[PDB]
Amino acid sequence: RVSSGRDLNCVPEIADTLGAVAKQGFDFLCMPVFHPRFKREFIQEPAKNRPGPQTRSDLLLSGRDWNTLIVGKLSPWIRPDSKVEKIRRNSEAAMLQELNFGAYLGLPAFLLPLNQEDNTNLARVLTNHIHTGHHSSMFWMRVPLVAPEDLRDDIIENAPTTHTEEYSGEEKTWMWWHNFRTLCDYSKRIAVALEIGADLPSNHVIDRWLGEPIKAAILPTSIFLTNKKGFPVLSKMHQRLIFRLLKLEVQFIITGTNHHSEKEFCSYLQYLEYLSQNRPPPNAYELFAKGYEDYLQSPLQPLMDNLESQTYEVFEKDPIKYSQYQQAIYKCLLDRVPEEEKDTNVQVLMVLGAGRGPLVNASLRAAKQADRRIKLYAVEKNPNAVVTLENWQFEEWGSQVTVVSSDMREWVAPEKADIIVSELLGSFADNELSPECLDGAQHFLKDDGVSIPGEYTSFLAPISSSKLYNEVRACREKDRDPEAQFEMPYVVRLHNFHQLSAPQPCFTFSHPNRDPMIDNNRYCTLEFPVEVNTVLHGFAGYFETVLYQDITLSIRPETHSPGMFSWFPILFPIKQPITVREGQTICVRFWRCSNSKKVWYEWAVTAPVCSAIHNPTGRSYTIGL
Amino acid sequence: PNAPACMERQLEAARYRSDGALLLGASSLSGRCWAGSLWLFKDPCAAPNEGFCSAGVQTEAGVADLTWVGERGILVASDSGAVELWELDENETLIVSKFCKYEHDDIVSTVSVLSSGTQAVSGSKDICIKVWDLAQQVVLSSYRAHAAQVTCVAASPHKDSVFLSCSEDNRILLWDTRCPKPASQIGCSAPGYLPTSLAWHPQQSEVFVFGDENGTVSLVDTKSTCVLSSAVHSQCVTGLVFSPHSVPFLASLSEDCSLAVLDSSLSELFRSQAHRDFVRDATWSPLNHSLLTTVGWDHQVVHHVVP
Numbered sequence A: 001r002v003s004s005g006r007d008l009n010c011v012p013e014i015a016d017t018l019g020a021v022a023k024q025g026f027d028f029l030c031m032p033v034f035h036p037r038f039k040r041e042f043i044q045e046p047a048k049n050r051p052g053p054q055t056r057s058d059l060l061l062s063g064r065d066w067n068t069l070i071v072g073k074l075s076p077w078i079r080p081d082s083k084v085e086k087i088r089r090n091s092e093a094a095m096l097q098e099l100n101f102g103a104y105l106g107l108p109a110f111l112l113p114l115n116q117e118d119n120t121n122l123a124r125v126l127t128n129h130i131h132t133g134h135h136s137s138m139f140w141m142r143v144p145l146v147a148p149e150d151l152r153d154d155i156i157e158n159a160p161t162t163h164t165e166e167y168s169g170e171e172k173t174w175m176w177w178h179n180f181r182t183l184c185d186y187s188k189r190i191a192v193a194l195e196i197g198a199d200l201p202s203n204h205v206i207d208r209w210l211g212e213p214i215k216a217a218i219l220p221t222s223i224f225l226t227n228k229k230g231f232p233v234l235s236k237m238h239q240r241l242i243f244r245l246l247k248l249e250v251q252f253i254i255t256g257t258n259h260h261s262e263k264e265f266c267s268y269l270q271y272l273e274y275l276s277q278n279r280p281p282p283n284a285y286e287l288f289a290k291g292y293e294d295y296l297q298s299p300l301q302p303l304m305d306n307l308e309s310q311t312y313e314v315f316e317k318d319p320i321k322y323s324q325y326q327q328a329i330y331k332c333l334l335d336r337v338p339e340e341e342k343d344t345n346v347q348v349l350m351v352l353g354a355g356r357g358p359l360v361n362a363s364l365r366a367a368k369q370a371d372r373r374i375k376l377y378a379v380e381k382n383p384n385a386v387v388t389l390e391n392w393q394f395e396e397w398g399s400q401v402t403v404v405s406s407d408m409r410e411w412v413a414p415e416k417a418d419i420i421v422s423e424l425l426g427s428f429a430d431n432e433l434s435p436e437c438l439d440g441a442q443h444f445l446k447d448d449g450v451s452i453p454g455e456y457t458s459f460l461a462p463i464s465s466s467k468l469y470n471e472v473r474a475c476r477e478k479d480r481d482p483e484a485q486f487e488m489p490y491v492v493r494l495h496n497f498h499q500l501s502a503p504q505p506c507f508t509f510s511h512p513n514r515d516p517m518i519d520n521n522r523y524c525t526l527e528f529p530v531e532v533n534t535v536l537h538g539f540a541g542y543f544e545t546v547l548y549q550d551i552t553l554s555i556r557p558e559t560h561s562p563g564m565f566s567w568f569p570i571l572f573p574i575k576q577p578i579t580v581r582e583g584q585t586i587c588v589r590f591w592r593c594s595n596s597k598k599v600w601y602e603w604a605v606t607a608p609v610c611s612a613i614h615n616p617t618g619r620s621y622t623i624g625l
Numbered sequence B: 001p002n003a004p005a006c007m008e009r010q011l012e013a014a015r016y017r018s019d020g021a022l023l024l025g026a027s028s029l030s031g032r033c034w035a036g037s038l039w040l041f042k043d044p045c046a047a048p049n050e051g052f053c054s055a056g057v058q059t060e061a062g063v064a065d066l067t068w069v070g071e072r073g074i075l076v077a078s079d080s081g082a083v084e085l086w087e088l089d090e091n092e093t094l095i096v097s098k099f100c101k102y103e104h105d106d107i108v109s110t111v112s113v114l115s116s117g118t119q120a121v122s123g124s125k126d127i128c129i130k131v132w133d134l135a136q137q138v139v140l141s142s143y144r145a146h147a148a149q150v151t152c153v154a155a156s157p158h159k160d161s162v163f164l165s166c167s168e169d170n171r172i173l174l175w176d177t178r179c180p181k182p183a184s185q186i187g188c189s190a191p192g193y194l195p196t197s198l199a200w201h202p203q204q205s206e207v208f209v210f211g212d213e214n215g216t217v218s219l220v221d222t223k224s225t226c227v228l229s230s231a232v233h234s235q236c237v238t239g240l241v242f243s244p245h246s247v248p249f250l251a252s253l254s255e256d257c258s259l260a261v262l263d264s265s266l267s268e269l270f271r272s273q274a275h276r277d278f279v280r281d282a283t284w285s286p287l288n289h290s291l292l293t294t295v296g297w298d299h300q301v302v303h304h305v306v307p
Ligand SMILES: *CCNc1ncnc2c1ccn2[C@@H]1O[C@H]([C@H](O)c2ccc(Cl)cc2)[C@@H](O)[C@H]1O
Pocket: A302, A303, A306, A307, A311, A312, A313, A315, A316, A352, A353, A354, A355, A356, A379, A380, A381, A382, A385, A406, A407, A408, A409, A423, A424, A425, A432, A433, A436, A437, A438
């Protein structure tokens, strides 16, 4: 089912019109709150002293209906950016009046057009309304994919429609929004209602609206084609855009009169319903993700913090993860234990960070299908998890499994290991400090020992998302640096965003670490070719890991282990967004830093312009050793 | 007389027929119900009084513009997106929906009947202009030439294929449906203020006039490229109607609530502060060429005697 509303600019009786609209299947109505033609004077006698009511009464609907069913519409004569002073002044007073009435009625939203380049005074007035108390209404800026000047019929003989391509010119409606929303200081109460035309622009123009807070998509009746039976439908390119828009959960607004007068008006809506039903259904990754879209979270630090029971349960319920660990152990045992020794040679196998035992069980299940013999140690520092291990051990595993209740860097071991197994990896690979752990744990690996995992690599990609930028921006908290929220990574199911460049590897680690003098500190420079005009708000992080040989795990989208929903991507924000023009290179710099107590990341953009270095000295964000 | 008891507060249109009987359009722009109505007054001086009138009817919606279709028919620009044709019965007592076609996507704001009288052209906030067949009850052609609301469309007095239009995109278009690209822009050099009202000169087929949103009326000779212009009003020029006089006078109305009457060189002859709200129309008496009738949103029907 779709959430969908009707747009009208003529309502003779609210009561009847709303009833008519509910009948046809719509969830809400967009209508004027003063009559669209009812121009009003605020300065000049005599017209200013016009008596009578200025509009209809709020008594005409229940407060409930006003709150849920009605979206206000600015009167289309209101022109705050006219070149005529008298009109600018009336339009100010008028805009304020209409907006203050919108808020008086408790309307959930209120539409305003962006239909020219200069909306500066319009933004000024709206902004001032927003800062006149902390009332919660939304503002939908009605803006078209294609400016009306660039879709006019080619019928003025001495003013033809330009037939040459204008890459930047064709995106101009995006920049109207960008300017307008920038002026209003990225208010969360200002969203886009994107109006779709009969002919769509080129793909890049549609791609500009990736990352933007599209709350609504306006579909005129005129854009609908007709199938052979007379019903209204849409071109396959228009259908593509609708499928993209359904993933953004936008409210669909239908505007204009009925052109398919052979059929009634619920048909237009019933088409969208049909299109909603007939999308590709929610896959095994995207079933769990639902709920967590663009929801910022703190990255776990299972070293510094002791993970909760339900937290272990989440990351345990992921069968792909463990069948791959089972397989990587299965294969390793074979390569180390020849068939002739399948009873004499017992492999010393240490799970480091055993949690509640799923890698212990995967280590058992693997030693069965390979028909080799294994002595297990299960090291876990979380004494709450160790409760679960020792209960498993007494009830099931017997003294095959020695549970060790220890930090792996404190533990003195009875014997060296043939295989160390671990899952100390986070969404940016090394962000739970797997390197530091396994380095301190290296002294109790046999001279010829194996680590599973043997390798992991972090990846980065630049992104545009004005939605997430604002989401981060909203994480200000008392009693700390007011920009600290920008100097820290979030784990998040990135959703409304545009990836500006192919992921590239950032930091790689190897275990066992042969290199005599080690140092897990790092400095990496990445250059991201960008082929679009866009605005950079951050860098998405992902990772890959080699458990053993060809057996791998990945959340890098292009090599994702299918159906591994555990790990969402990471997000490194930046403080000020950076304009990027098509053909430019975004150069970013990442450092992994540490002292003996803390590890952290720092980062900056150097091209096309420089940012500040983010998180210097881990002032805003550190990972505890 | 078979009509509504109360007529709506806001009078939009006022047009004399060839015999002298007054047509009135009214909408309600405030209050519970936002609709409109059509009214005939064989007594010009009895208007706007409802029960002492010749005929009347309610429209579903408001009335942005109307005009006569000859002598029996009334063409209507609705808020609904409808062009509607209402025609009198033979007795001239009822007023009957002849057709009501929902063809524009937003409010229909301007309408003008062509010289044949069997075709007409409507303009709208949906940015389109449409040419209509009044016998067949259809849109023959539909043109999106403009980039903003179409503010005014005016048929050529005598040439059935020619008409003006003007829009909030700052364009004044001379149309000629005979040409394959029918529209043609008439640049008054700069981006000077938006065109608000239009009127062809009734005796010179090459001439027209237009008013702007800054209260300036201007004299245009099609080809020459803005002869003369006068700052007549202090606010938007809502309408321009030339008189039926031999060397005619030009009535100019505005949102400064003032009528003015102008000569060949746009010099001011008369001026009336009579209205206390916006002046929405003007129509000259075909029985007395000194007389001029205005309506307003103050619900007055003034009758001016012009020297
Ligand atoms: C690396 C330094 N110290 C150390 N010693 C022992 N156990 C450690 C540890 C650091 C983390 N951990 C344990 O590793 C487990 C791992 O992070 C994890 C997380 C989720 C799931 Cl489902 C399994 C395993 C944690 O259990 C952590 O305490």
